[PDB]
Design a protein around this ligand. Structure first.
Ligand SMILES: [Ca+2]
Ligand SMILES: [Ca+2]
Lengths: 56, 142
């Protein structure tokens, strides 16, 4: 139940960013739909990008 | 055994703009780098960041490399958006940070540090479990 946590490891980091990019280049994964619009697409990737750059 | 990520150093006088490199080593040994994010701290009363630019080891930096700086933290995010074809495969400079030096009354060395957070992915985007991080600094000499 942790948004952005692609590989379910308790961290939201570059590994998740890469996993999301691969995913979109290839279904519905709830914790990857970070804007809750019932799609996982490049908008979710862009949101995760901005999050990672603003995190700390 | 581990990916080395090292912040280097620089020096100058108040008002100078200096370049601090961020270097990767043992890249091939760790199966290349496909993605990474990390966070550096600096003293914002002594340094202001002017720019952050990808180094020679990053291919297609305009697409694959991003950074942001705010109030004492610099963020970095790299991803090979081709997944297989623009990996970091060589040892060398990953990024160059340009800081403008602020005023000091006596010669001072101030740290540029790794803050907690982020991860490094190898050439298959799998976690690199051992990353040896070395903090850097800037020396301001009035
Ligand atoms: Ca994760
Ligand atoms: Ca979405």
């Amino acid at each position: 139940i942790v948004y952005g946590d692609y590989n379910n490891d308790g961290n939201v980091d570059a590994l998740d960013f890469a996993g999301l990019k691969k995913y979109i280049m290839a279904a519905y994964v709830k914790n990857l739909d970070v804007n809750l619009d019932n799609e996982v697409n490049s908008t979710d990737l862009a949101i995760l990008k901005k999050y990672l750059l603003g995190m700390v | 055994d581990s990916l080395k990520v090292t912040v280097g150093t620089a020096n100058g006088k108040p008002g100078d703009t200096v370049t601090v490199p961020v270097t990767f080593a043992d890249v091939a040994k760790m199966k290349n780098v496909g993605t990474c994010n990390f966070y550096l701290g600096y003293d914002a009363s002594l340094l202001e960041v002017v720019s952050v630019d990808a180094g020679p080891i990053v291919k297609n930096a305009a697409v694959n490399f991003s950074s942001s700086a705010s109030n004492g933290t610099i963020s970095f995010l790299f991803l090979d958006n081709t997944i297989t074809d623009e990996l970091i495969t060589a040892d060398g400079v990953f990024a160059n940070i340009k800081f403008k030096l602020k005023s000091v009354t006596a010669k001072t060395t101030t740290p540029v540090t790794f803050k907690d957070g982020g991860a490094f992915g190898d050439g298959t985007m799998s976690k690199i479990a051992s990353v040896t991080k070395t903090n850097g600094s800037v020396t301001i000499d009035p």
